[PDB]
Every structure is written in structure tokens, then in C-alpha cells.
Paper text:
The [name]-[name]-2 3C-like protease (3CLpro), also known as [name] ([name]) and nonstructural protein 5 ([name]), is a promising drug target for [name]-19 therapy. 3CLpro is an essential enzyme for viral growth and is responsible for cleaving polypeptides pp1a/pp1ab. − 3CLpro has a characteristic catalytic dyad consisting of C145–H41, where H41 promotes deprotonation of the C145 thiol to generate a highly nucleophilic thiolate that undergoes proteolytic cleavage. Owing to these features, covalent inhibitors targeting C145 have garnered considerable attention in 3CLpro inhibitor research.
Based on a comprehensive PK study, we selected compound 17 (development code S-892216) as a potential clinical candidate for further evaluation. S-892216 is a reversible covalent 3CLpro inhibitor with highly potent antiviral activity and an EC50 value of 2.48 nM against [name]-[name]-2 infected cells. Covalent bond formation of the nitrile warhead produced an imine that formed a hydrogen bond with the main chain of C145, and the two carbonyl oxygen atoms of the pyrimidine-dione core formed hydrogen bonds with the main chains of E166 and G143. Compared to ensitrelvir which formed CH-π interaction of the S1′ indazole moiety and the M49 side chain, the S1′ moiety of S-892216 caused conformational change of the M49 side chain and filled the binding groove where the M49 side chain originally was. The results indicate that S-892216 is a reversible covalent inhibitor with an estimated observed dissociation rates (k off(obs)) value of 4.06 × 10–5 s–1.
Numbering used by the authors: 3 to 301
The structure:
């Protein structure tokens, strides 16, 4: 059992390099618009507290260089939308996939295509944490890398990378330029909230373990939503709702294991630990697989 990303080809053909003066980062080219982080218009002296509006007045169309590999795009308009710039270009991307922009909820997963200088370098699976950070793997130059899901033909873009916080976790926006959580595109102290564990995801992963033949943690007990939620609170797990129970319905049905029974098994794991045993080759409880992801990789 492994985190698996979506095939990246459809997004790879959308990545470009954006340069404003001496500042370069990655952009996303869809139809005749390139999307990128607005901090492309900054220099180092700006970063403690940029006035983006004032910085952008000194910028004309020709001050943005956009390159799609070799293909050299002509910028014919620009605007700022929240924390992204939209550069209108003369040429529609011929490789534009069917796509949508979506603002995800905490707990939801997506693939990241990490890019440097407009070139794709790696793909991996990630999650929006409850505190609205993502635990990405990004180096300097990665801004403008995107997070997405692929449903049949359609690319659903949900994340654009902006910044690494001092703690080494990552913050960024939806493709409308609104940050997830309370983060801002300046270099101030921005402490994260409690990184709580995504309970419904852990349950989904326990079901995937049963589907794949790891069953040692199935115990004799059941519990109630309220009693389980006391336990979740003590262990900094998200509260489980009836909605969560409902979305676990297919996995429950497939395995014959009532969601509240699986809850009682999780309770025991939280209270007693894993006593040196593994689940799906992991020595901790994994929370970055959704119910939806589990179905994908199991059947
Ligand atoms: C991303 N392509 C470059 N970079 C930044 N940058 C780029 C600048 C801000 C320096 C500049 F030229 F003036 C504009 C940041 C960053 C730092 C502070 C801040 F408020 C923002 Cl909005 C961004 C950054 O964090 N990273 C980054 C991203 N992911 C991982 C790492 Cl190790 C660094 C970055 O590459």
C-alpha cells in the first residue's frame, strides 16, 4: 500500500516559466491565461510587507516574460486576483486539458507536480491539513507548482504553491488566489494551529488494511459516536460526524465491519499504540488517504 498520485501528463503540458525582472517562478497556462503567484512582482526588499498594488503599477504587459519550454508567449494583458496574477497571452495552450478550479476542504487529498523554472521534476500525493497547511516537499523555485485531482478526463486544480513557513510546512492558494487558512504572502511570523489528525481518513485506511489482509487490530468492542469523540479529542483527532460515517458506508459494506466497530478498534490503537506491529507496512496511523482514495487503490 502506497500513496499514489494521478498521472501528471495533462498538467505537465500546462507548466510555464514566468519572469518579472530578475524574479522567476512557475505558472499554469490554461487556454490563453497564465496563472501565477503575485509575489513574482517582488524583490527581496519587498518581502517583509509588500504593497502589491503599488508594486504592480510599475509593471506593464511587456515586464512579464512567459516561456512554455521553448515556446515564447506574448503577454497582452495582466490583472491581479486576490494573491495570483492572471497574464493574458496571445496563444491558447493547445495542450489545455478539460479542467475546473475547486477550493478543497481540509482532509481532502490531491497530487502535486513539483516544478522548478517551468519544468516538472516530481509528483506526489498530499493533503490539506486541518490547520490549512500542506506537508509538501518543495525547495526554493517551487512557487507556482500546482495541486490537482483527475476525474476521468477532467483536471480539477485545487492548490497553487506560494511559500514555505518557518516550521517547514507549506501554504498556498486556490486558483482564484485565496489562501487556504489565514496565511498571507509576506515574510512575517505565521504560526500554524494544532495539526490535528484526519479521523475519517484514518478509518478509511483501516478499511483498506482489512481489504488487503491486515486484520490484527480488529477487536471485540464497539463504541458510540459521542464516546469515540471524547477519545478523538484527547488524541488531537478531528471529531467524527454522521456525515463522515455516511461516506464510509461503501467500505463498511464491502468489509462487513460497522463504522462504530472500526471506531472502537481505532480507540484501542490510540489508547495502547501499535505495540511494535505494522498496518499496511506503516508503524503509525496514516491520515492522508480519503475514503475515495482507498477505493481507487483497492478496487
Ligand atoms: C518561489 N518560487 C521563490 N520563493 C519565495 N519567494 C520569492 C520571493 C518570495 C523572493 C522575491 F524574489 F522577493 C520574491 C518564498 C517566499 C518567502 C516569503 C514570502 F512572504 C513568500 Cl509569499 C514567499 C518561499 O517561501 N519559497 C519557497 C517555497 N517552498 C519551499 C521553499 Cl524551501 C521555499 C520560494 O521558493
Amino acid at each position: 500500500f502506497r500513496k499514489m498520485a494521478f498521472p501528471s501528463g495533462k498538467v505537465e503540458g500546462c507548466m510555464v516559466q514566468v519572469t518579472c525582472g530578475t524574479t522567476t517562478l512557475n505558472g499554469l497556462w490554461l487556454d490563453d491565461v497564465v496563472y501565477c503567484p503575485r509575489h513574482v512582482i517582488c524583490t527581496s526588499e519587498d518581502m517583509l510587507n509588500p504593497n502589491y498594488e503599488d508594486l504592480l503599477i510599475r509593471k506593464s504587459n511587456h515586464n512579464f516574460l512567459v516561456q512554455a519550454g521553448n515556446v515564447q508567449l506574448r503577454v497582452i494583458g495582466h490583472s491581479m486576483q486576490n494573491c495570483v496574477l492572471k497574464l493574458k497571452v496571445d496563444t491558447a495552450n493547445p495542450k489545455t486539458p478539460k479542467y475546473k478550479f475547486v477550493r478543497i476542504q481540509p482532509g481532502q487529498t490531491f497530487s502535486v507536480l513539483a516544478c522548478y523554472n517551468g519544468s516538472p521534476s516530481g509528483v506526489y500525493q498530499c493533503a490539506m491539513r486541518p490547520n490549512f497547511t500542506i506537508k509538501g516537499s518543495f525547495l526554493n523555485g517551487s512557487c507556482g507548482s500546482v495541486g490537482f485531482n483527475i476525474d476521468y478526463d477532467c483536471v480539477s486544480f485545487c492548490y497553487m504553491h506560494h511559500m514555505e513557513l518557518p516550521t517547514g510546512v507549506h501554504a498556498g492558494t486556490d486558483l482564484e488566489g485565496n489562501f487556504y487558512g489565514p496565511f498571507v504572502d509576506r515574510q512575517t511570523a505565521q504560526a500554524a494551529g494544532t495539526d490535528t489528525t484526519i479521523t475519517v481518513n484514518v478509518l478509511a485506511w483501516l478499511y483498506a488494511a482489512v481489504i488487503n489482509g491486515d486484520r490484527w487490530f480488529l477487536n471485540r468492542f464497539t463504541t458510540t459516536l459521542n464516546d469515540f469523540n471524547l477519545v478523538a479529542m484527547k488524541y488531537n483527532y478531528e471529531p467524527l460526524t454522521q456525515d463522515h460515517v455516511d461516506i464510509l458506508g461503501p467500505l463498511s459494506a464491502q468489509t462487513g465491519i460497522a463504522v462504530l466497530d472500526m471506531c472502537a478498534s481505532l480507540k484501542e490503537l490510540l489508547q495502547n499504540g501499535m505495540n511494535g506491529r505494522t498496518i499496511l507496512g506503516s508503524a503509525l496511523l496514516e491520515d492522508e488517504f480519503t475514503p475515495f482514495d482507498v477505493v481507487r487503490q483497492c478496487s
